[PDB]
């Protein structure tokens, strides 16, 4: 939109098999995994996503309180499980300027990986703009 | 404008079935009673590709061999507007469901009368 700009958000994921586990050969290892949502500034650099007021990790429903609300930075979550799954990361702009959803795949193929997502961020509203203008040139 | 989730349930054993449903306030699958018509825009190789279903349930039975992308055109009641769902037909699962979040107009009195049976309005 000519009333929005493109902003890249980054999901940084980590996971490791928990050491010292008593598991048989046909049984799944438990892993400590973690995810954090960052923002890319105009240079390509990781910065705090200060244009978001709230972030929700919609975990797989086998977890309990699977709707994990994060009302403040940092938008970090860590957890223990055995399974890979796709999750909604529901992100809310500051200034009540709207929301978007990132569909992120939690996978255990690497020790750490990052995935980038492009979003249309509105640049018409004043309160969101004062924060956006710290990272991007707005029309 | 409020958010309503439309869900397409596809089955196959190919005798494949599709049925457009919607999620109510609790997340239970219910028939999309907020829709006038629901046309399934099949692939051209089928005869009479446009399948107009004037009444509920919006449920089709068909036999085929290929996997195609399918337009599910949905009209709101009281001529409140249109929207299209892009559903891909696949065969490596005997059954699956896919959700689609749609913006529904909140300024058509006839449409919100049926909308109000299920959700609260702004």
């Amino acid at each position: 939109s000519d009333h929005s700009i493109e902003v890249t958000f980054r999901v940084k994921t980590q996971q490791v098999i928990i050491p010292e586990q008593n598991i048989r050969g046909n049984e799944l290892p438990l892993r400590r995994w973690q995810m954090e949502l960052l923002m890319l500034d105009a240079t390509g650099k990781e910065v705090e996503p200060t244009i978001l007021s709230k972030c929700i990790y919609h975990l797989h429903s086998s977890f309990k309180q699977p709707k994990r609300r994060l009302n403040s930075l940092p938008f970090f979550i860590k957890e223990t499980g055995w399974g890979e799954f796709n999750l909604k990361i529901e992100c809310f702009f500051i200034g009540n300027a709207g929301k978007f959803s990132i569909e992120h795949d939690l996978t255990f193929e690497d020790d750490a990986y990052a995935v980038d997502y492009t979003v249309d961020v509105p640049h018409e509203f004043s309160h969101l703009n004062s924060e956006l203008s710290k990272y991007f040139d707005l029309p | 404008s409020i958010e309503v989730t439309f869900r397409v349930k596809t089955q196959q054993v190919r005798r494949w079935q599709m049925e457009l449903l919607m999620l109510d306030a609790t997340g239970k699958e219910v028939e999309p009673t907020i829709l006038s018509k629901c046309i399934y825009h099949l692939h051209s190789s089928f005869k009479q590709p446009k399948r107009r279903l004037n009444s509920l349930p919006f449920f089709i039975k068909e036999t085929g061999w290929g996997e195609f992308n399918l337009k599910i055109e949905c009209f709101f009641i009281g001529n409140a507007g249109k929207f299209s769902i892009e559903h891909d037909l696949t065969f490596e699962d005997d059954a699956y469901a896919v959700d689609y979040t749609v913006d529904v107009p909140h300024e058509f009195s006839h449409l919100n009368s049926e909308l109000s049976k299920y959700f609260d309005l702004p």
């Binding site: 890979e84 799954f85 999750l87 | -």
Partner: peptide, 20 residues
């Protein structure tokens, strides 16, 4: 809530405490 397929799946990559 009845789940759609994408949110419903949970999958396991490997068994055993061995990193592949």
């Amino acid at each position: 809530k009845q789940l759609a397929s994408k949110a419903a799946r949970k999958s396991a990559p490997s068994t055993g405490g061995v990193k592949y």
